[PDB]
Design a protein around this ligand. Structure first.
Ligand SMILES: C[C@H](CCC(=O)O)[C@H]1CC[C@H]2[C@@H]3[C@H](O)C[C@@H]4C[C@H](O)CC[C@]4(C)[C@H]3C[C@H](O)[C@]12C
Length: 240
């Protein structure tokens, strides 16, 4: 059912905030359990962050935050360490928006990962790969790039193909930092071809990219790879 949250993010058009609030409240009444103060306050942080992207017109990051909160409550009980990945991303975002240095935001992120049942070997290993990728920048890119490196190593055993999808997007981000916009769309296509992952996905990318280029400002080369990630993941989920 996690493919529902990815499809809703891929769906483009106050509306996104009110739909996200309904989806988070839906997952709460669909999983049954009562919400704790930690998760209640993490949701308020995500709703304040997406409200900040509203007033400044960052519609891509906006729905990205709404998807993290919806996935965070979905993995409340099913996959506890994954909820740590989602909420540590939320904490890194808010702390970086408060003028934090990278080491401080990473150390506070390690606290949250440890608390939600992530082994210290993976916490330190994720803190080592994240520090290198960060020192190559918006706080959105820092929180997402670091949390992606942590999700790859936690995906030992469970969903070990999904680590490849994270691996490629990280390698794609490092190789498209100097490439142009259209050159990065070619590279994202070429990487999607290297992994295959059926067709229709290769078009879903062109749809989302051209949808962002026809209306609004054109997006960053980081956000291209972020778009290609959501297409490949949704392909893998429907394939299963
Ligand atoms: C792939 C994994 C689980 C997917 C699922 O089956 O629900 C999901 C769970 C939380 C997701 C992360 C969170 O949504 C936080 C980040 C959101 C960004 O838009 C992508 C990177 C980002 C770090 C996401 C990477 C990946 O999509 C994660 C780690």
């Amino acid at each position: 059912p996690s493919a529902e949250i990815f499809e809703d993010f891929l769906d483009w058009y106050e509306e996104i905030i009110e739909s996200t609030d309904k989806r988070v409240e839906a997952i709460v009444e669909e999983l049954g359990g009562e919400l704790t103060e930690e998760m209640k306050e993490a949701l308020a942080m995500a709703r304040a962050a997406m409200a900040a992207f509203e007033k400044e017109g960052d519609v891509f990051r906006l729905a990205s935050v709404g998807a993290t909160a919806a996935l965070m409550v979905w993995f409340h009980l099913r996959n506890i360490p994954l909820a740590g990945i989602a909420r540590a991303w939320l904490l890194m975002l808010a702390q970086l928006e408060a003028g934090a240095d990278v080491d401080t935001a990473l150390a506070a992120a390690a606290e949250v990962l440890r608390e939600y049942g992530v082994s210290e070997e993976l916490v330190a290993a994720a803190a080592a790969e994240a520090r290198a990728l960060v020192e190559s920048l918006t706080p959105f890119e820092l929180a997402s790039l670091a949390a992606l490196a942590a999700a790859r190593l936690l995906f030992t055993a469970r969903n070990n193909p999904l680590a490849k999808i994270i691996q490629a997007a990280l390698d794609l981000y490092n190789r498209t930092v100097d490439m142009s916009t259209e050159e990065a769309v070619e590279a994202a296509l070429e990487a999607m071809k290297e992994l295959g992952a059926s067709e229709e996905s290769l078009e879903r990318l062109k749809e989302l990219v051209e949808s962002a280029r026809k209306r609004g400002i054109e997006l960053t080369p980081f956000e291209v790879a972020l778009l290609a990630y959501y297409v490949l993941v949704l392909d893998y989920l429907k394939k299963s």
